[PDB]
Design a protein around this ligand. Structure first.
Ligand SMILES: [Mg+2]
Ligand SMILES: [Mg+2]
Ligand SMILES: [Mg+2]
Ligand SMILES: [Mg+2]
Ligand SMILES: [Mg+2]
Ligand SMILES: [Mg+2]
Ligand SMILES: [Mg+2]
Ligand SMILES: [Mg+2]
Ligand SMILES: [Mg+2]
Ligand SMILES: [Mg+2]
Ligand SMILES: [Mg+2]
Ligand SMILES: [Mg+2]
Ligand SMILES: [Mg+2]
Ligand SMILES: [Mg+2]
Ligand SMILES: [Mg+2]
Ligand SMILES: [Mg+2]
Lengths: 81, 209, 124, 25, 210, 72, 129, 86, 99
RNA sequence: UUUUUUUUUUUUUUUUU
RNA sequence: AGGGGAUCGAAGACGAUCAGAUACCGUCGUAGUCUUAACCAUAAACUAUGCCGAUUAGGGAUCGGACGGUGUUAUUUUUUGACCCGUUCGGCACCUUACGAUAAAUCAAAAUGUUUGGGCUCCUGGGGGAGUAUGGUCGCAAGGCUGAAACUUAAAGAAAUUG
């Protein structure tokens, strides 16, 4: 190309490249709130949780860890923080 | 844009209509790294949609280079496949260039005793992949090359690229139509920029014998 | 085998490329033609040239041959080239049937006035 | 001569040399 | 007499100096052009090398001649031609040598008075395995090259230079081509004095319409 | 080239490696071992004197046919 | 294992320069690299260089103007005496009026010509011309 | 230049408009693209034009097209083709 | 001189491949190096297909096809004209012959 | 896709407008 | 040193071929081939290409993981599997090209090297004699590792070219 402004790449490129290979290694993970069915408690869950998260006092599993990404239990709504 | 580009050269709806009708926006399924700037979007089926705005804008620049020579006999146009052959002879007819259709004899530019010695000043080719012999000979005698490059078309020595479909008969004629009209306006044989031209489009479209 | 040499073929083509109206399909008349126009001084060679000339003349009556103009073709290909239909195939006379990405280019380029008929794009 | 069996010939000759030395020792 | 566009312009007086041609990458195809612009040239023959092709009825013997052309003003050319006869090979080599004449940049060693005496930088050319390296030398140091390379440097006008060589220097054809590459590349190594904007001008070929 | 050490404190390795590899040089090995003083027919001298024991003829190597005249 | 970040910067610079690129990305960031770049910039052999800050070793984007023949490092950093500059310059540079040999002295990162003025010496670390 | 301020070089080579490398005398394949300016009526002006010189190296690599686009906008000959962010 | 980029086989990254026996030599050759032909032809020759259909009783019988996999060494395939010596440039063409 | 071993020594080319 | 011993098959015995045939071919056939315990430590043990690290032309396949989208298919209190498109990390490789390299064949490394310095280890110095002799050390042995010299010779050798 011989002429690229490497300081300010496209935001589409940022979502395309690897999380380390960008100009500044911004993590691709996030924190998210899980609404469990039958109760009204909000629990913060990591997007890539490695443990079976159970709500505080509801005794209900909220997500199962698999393949480097938590799979939320069916019947629960979520909202990224 | 403000400098050395008055607002008259901007695209018109008629030019956009003819280019779209010719399907000059439908590019090859393979994308080249050097044809990336001319890419607009890629459809769901994998067919690359080009940016017609750049195509017209590049055509104006190509005409500017042609008009700068100020000698029609020093401009050479080449097309191997018969689809571009009909347009090339007609382009030479109205402009004043020297045209070669079909097979390009090797040694035309380098060997000076062959029957087709040219000594041109500008090589204009269609589909610069089957005309690689013409391009490579231009690498020996310092001739800038203007090519109707496609998305997958090699750009080995293409100095000025015109991103357009170069496989359909309709697309080739329309692009060769754009350049023919622009060159004549620049040189001055046409008095008005807004006046329609008497020759029409199907005169350049390839026809069977 | 009886394969004619290049000195016969090349000379005969020049005869056809120049003297087509004078020539005809009769060998005996073509025999006399080669007498007046060429300088052969060899009956065998002249008979071969007239014989090969007659072969192509009969070929001309079918549409062949490439590369032996025959200026009557040259004037003919002129009128073929000049021919052009009056109605342009690029005319919209449903006017312009393109897809979602093509019309998006029109909005980007500032030409959102063409009678564009947007068609769906799906993969089978 | 093949190097495989030039090696074998020398290796056989080395074994005979060691027997001649054991005889003297 | 002229057959190419340059040939017509040269005899028509449209080109004033040879380096005017050299500014644009215009190939020279007619050797009458070089004789016109560069008279008083001196041709020297290095060696006649017999090369043989094996045939079913003996060896086909051809003679190869290596000729360097140059004037002490800073132009050299190298031509190699193989032919059946020595006399024809020599003549054809001279024509090829005149065609491939290149300008030679001359620099200096520290001073700036009577400057054109040595190379401007250190340049090396590599043809095949032979590598010949040319080094600028202080004034008063004569040529320190081998007789084959020394004669070529004399025709270039270089007076002071340090030379070294690796590879199979016994290949006289390879060394001269290696030396020629170094002399070619000494005029295009970017230097501070050339680190200046230049006003681009149209080539004479594209401005004259004769 | 070679993967020679390039540290600033690797002179010992560089000298030791050169000392080992210099033995493969034929002329240094001849001088360092002192083979002229050990195995040469002369004691390393340019000339030597002796008593002629007999006259012998030596056939010349190909391509050459002659009897070179020599003495033991 | 990274051993000479200075070599990585100059190798990346030279690779982009030979390829004709007008800019190059340099990782990581070091005090020596920035000072070595500034020596380039004073003589104009490069253009703008911009350092990107991060919570780690930084990055540098150098804009190249194309007037740069060759830049290289010296390993190891030999201890150079004042009488040894001329031998180092002769054996390593082109003609002795274009290039600049880079030393590290008690006065900092600075040129071989500047050493002759200040009458100081030190360790050779790089060069350019 | 010498101490007297006189040029003794036989001639001064040109530099590529894209990479800045000196174009050698025998560097065939190095083109010189010439673009003529226009007036407000779109008529090309004779004898007055933009001249670009490209080395054979940049042409051979296949970057001659993109470099020309960058150069044209830097001198204003194009409206919107060359995108730095791309 | 290295004659072929892939040497003579396909085991880059495989270390060691168990050998097999040539069809008409019994030569012990590696499976990937061997030259393998899968042949599918009618169990009765085309000349005698009609007579078999005549004896069909039971006249809708389809003659089965023999399913052979022939493995050859280099010497046998070349001598058997299964493969032929190709030119220096033509050796690299890894495409089956067209029909 | 039956087999077919051997060939005594040396000797086999040069310059320019 | 035990167990096992179907097949094949060094050595050996025959039958052919041949001038001879201690070989190729055919019939037998011992050790071995298989296994437990203990040795041996060498292979064209090859990608004939040491390990770590950075950069440098494009492209499509494929394997493992992850991510985003889309529509069929099986299940399903709508999740998962198969197929499709794309992005990315890590692999086995491959295709075209030479801004480069090499003597060349060829090489995305054998590039970034006479414009010669990122770190480390090992090996080589014309061909033989010779991986031999001797000394040491390991092994039950076969042998392995280390490893010369006298003497002899103008070439040996690598890649391509035309016959
Ligand atoms: Mg040597
Ligand atoms: Mg150190
Ligand atoms: Mg001899
Ligand atoms: Mg193995
Ligand atoms: Mg024989
Ligand atoms: Mg005998
Ligand atoms: Mg014998
Ligand atoms: Mg070993
Ligand atoms: Mg090995
Ligand atoms: Mg690496
Ligand atoms: Mg992959
Ligand atoms: Mg995958
Ligand atoms: Mg793998
Ligand atoms: Mg030696
Ligand atoms: Mg040796
Ligand atoms: Mg050989």
């Amino acid at each position: 190309v011989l002429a690229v402004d490497l300081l300010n790449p496209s935001p589409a490129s940022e979502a395309r490249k690897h999380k380390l290979k960008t100009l500044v290694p911004a993590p691709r993970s996030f924190f998210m709130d899980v609404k469990c069915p039958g109760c009204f408690t909000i629990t913060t869950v990591f997007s890539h949780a490695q443990t079976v998260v159970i709500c505080q006092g509801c005794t209900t599993v909220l997500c199962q860890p698999t393949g480097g990404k938590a799979r939320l239990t069916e019947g629960c709504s979520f909202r990224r923080k | 844009a403000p400098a050395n580009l008055p607002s008259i050269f901007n695209a018109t709806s008629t030019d956009i209509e003819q280019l779209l009708a010719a399907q000059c926006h439908i590019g090859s399924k393979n994308l080249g790294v050097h044809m990336q700037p001319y890419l607009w979007k890629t459809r769901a089926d994998g067919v690359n949609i080009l940016n017609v705005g750049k195509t017209w804008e590049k055509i104006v620049l190509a005409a500017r280079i042609i008009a700068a020579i100020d000698n029609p006999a020093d401009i050479c146009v080449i097309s191997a496949r018969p689809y571009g052959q009909r347009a090339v002879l007609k382009f030479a007819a109205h402009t004043g260039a020297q045209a070669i259709a079909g097979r390009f004899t090797p040694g035309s530019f380098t060997n000076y005793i062959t029957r087709s010695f040219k000594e041109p000043r500008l090589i204009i080719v269609t589909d610069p992949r089957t005309d690689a012999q013409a391009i490579k000979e231009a690498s020996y005698v310092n001739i800038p090359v203007i090519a109707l490059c496609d998305a997958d078309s090699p750009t080995e020595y293409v100095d000025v690229a015109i991103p357009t479909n170069n496989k359909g008969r309709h697309a080739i004629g329309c692009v060769w139509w754009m350049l023919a009209r622009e060159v004549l306006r620049l040189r001055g044989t046409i008095y008005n920029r807004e006046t329609p031209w008497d020759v029409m489009v199907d005169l350049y479209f390839y026809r069977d014998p | 085998g009886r394969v004619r040499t290049k000195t016969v073929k090349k000379s005969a083509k020049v005869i056809i490329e120049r003297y087509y109206p004078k020539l005809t399909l009769d060998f005996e008349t073509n025999k006399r033609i080669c007498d007046e126009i060429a300088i052969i001084a060899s009956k065998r060679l002249r008979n071969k040239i007239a014989g090969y000339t007659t072969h192509l003349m009969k070929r001309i009556q079918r549409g062949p041959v490439r590369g032996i103009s025959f200026k009557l073709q040259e004037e003919e290909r002129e009128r073929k080239d000049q021919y052009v239909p009056e109605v342009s195939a690029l005319d919209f006379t449903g006017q312009l049937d393109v897809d979602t990405e093509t019309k998006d280019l029109l909005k980007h380029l500032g030409f959102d006035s063409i009678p564009v008929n947007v068609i769906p794009v799906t993969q089978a | 001569m093949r190097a495989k069996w030039r090696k074998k010939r020398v290796r056989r000759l080395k074994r005979k040399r060691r027997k001649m030395r054991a005889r003297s020792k | 007499q002229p057959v190419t566009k340059l040939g017509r312009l040269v005899k028509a007086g449209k080109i004033k100096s040879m380096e005017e041609i050299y500014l644009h990458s215009l190939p020279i195809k007619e050797y009458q052009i070089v004789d016109f612009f560069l008279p008083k040239l001196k041709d020297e023959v290095m060696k006649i090398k017999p090369v043989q092709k094996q045939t079913r009825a003996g060896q086909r013997t051809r003679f190869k001649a290596i000729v360097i052309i140059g004037d002490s003003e800073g132009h050299v050319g190298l031509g190699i031609k193989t032919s059946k006869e020595v006399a024809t090979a020599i003549r054809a080599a001279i024509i090829i040598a005149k065609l491939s004449v290149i300008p030679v940049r001359r620099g200096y060693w520290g001073a700036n008075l009577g400057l054109p005496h040595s190379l401007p930088v250190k340049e090396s050319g590599k043809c095949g395995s032979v590598t010949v390296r040319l080094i600028p030398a202080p004034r008063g140091t004569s040529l320190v090259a081998s007789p084959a390379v020394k004669r070529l440097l004399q025709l270039a006008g270089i007076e002071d230079a340090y030379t070294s060589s690796s590879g199979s220097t016994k290949t006289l054809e390879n060394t001269l081509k290696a030396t020629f590459a170094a002399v070619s590349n000494t005029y295009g190594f970017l230097t501070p004095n050339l680190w200046k904007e230049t006003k681009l001008t149209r080539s004479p070929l594209e401005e004259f319409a004769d | 080239s070679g993967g020679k050490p390039r540290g600033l404190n690797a002179a010992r390795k560089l000298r030791n490696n050169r000392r080992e590899q210099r033995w493969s040089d034929l002329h240094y090995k001849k001088r360092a071992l002192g083979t002229a003083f050990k195995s040469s027919p002369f004691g390393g001298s340019s000339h030597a004197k002796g008593i002629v024991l007999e006259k012998v003829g030596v056939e010349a190597k190909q391509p050459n046919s002659a009897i070179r005249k020599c003495v033991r | 294992v990274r051993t000479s970040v200075l070599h990585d910067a100059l190798n990346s610079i030279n690779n982009a320069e030979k390829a004709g690129k007008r800019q190059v990305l340099i990782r990581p960031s070091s005090k020596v690299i920035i000072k070595f770049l500034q020596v380039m910039q004073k003589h104009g052999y490069i253009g703008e260089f911009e350092e990107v800050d991060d919570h780690r070793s930084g990055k540098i984007v150098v804009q190249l103007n194309g007037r740069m023949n060759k830049c290289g490092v010296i390993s190891p950093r030999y201890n150079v005496r004042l009488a040894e500059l001329e031998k180092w310059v002769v054996k390593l540079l082109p003609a002795r009026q274009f290039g600049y040999v880079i030393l590290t002295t008690s006065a900092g990162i600075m040129d071989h010509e500047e050493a002759r003025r200040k009458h100081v010496s030190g360790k050779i670390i790089g060069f350019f011309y | 230049e010498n101490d007297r301020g006189e040029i003794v070089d036989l001639y001064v080579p040109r530099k590529c408009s894209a990479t800045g490398r000196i174009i050698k005398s025998k560097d065939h394949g190095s083109c010189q693209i010439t673009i003529a300016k226009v007036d407000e009526n779109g008529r090309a002006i004779q004898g007055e034009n933009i001249i670009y010189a490209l080395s054979g190296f940049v042409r051979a690599m296949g970057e001659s097209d993109d470099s020309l686009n960058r150069l044209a906008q830097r001198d204003g000959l194009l409206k919107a083709v060359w995108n730095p962010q791309r | 001189v290295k004659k072929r980029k892939n040497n003579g086989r396909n085991k880059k990254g495989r270390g060691h491949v168990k050998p097999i026996r040539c069809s008409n030599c019994s030569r012990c050759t590696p499976k990937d190096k061997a030259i393998k032909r899968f042949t599918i032809r009618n169990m009765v020759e085309s000349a005698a297909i009609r007579d078999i259909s005549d004896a069909s009783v039971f006249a809708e019988y389809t003659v089965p096809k023999m399913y052979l996999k022939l493995q050859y060494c280099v010497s046998c395939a070349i001598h058997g004209k299964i493969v032929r010596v190709r030119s220096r440039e033509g050796r690299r063409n890894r495409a089956p012959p067209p029909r």
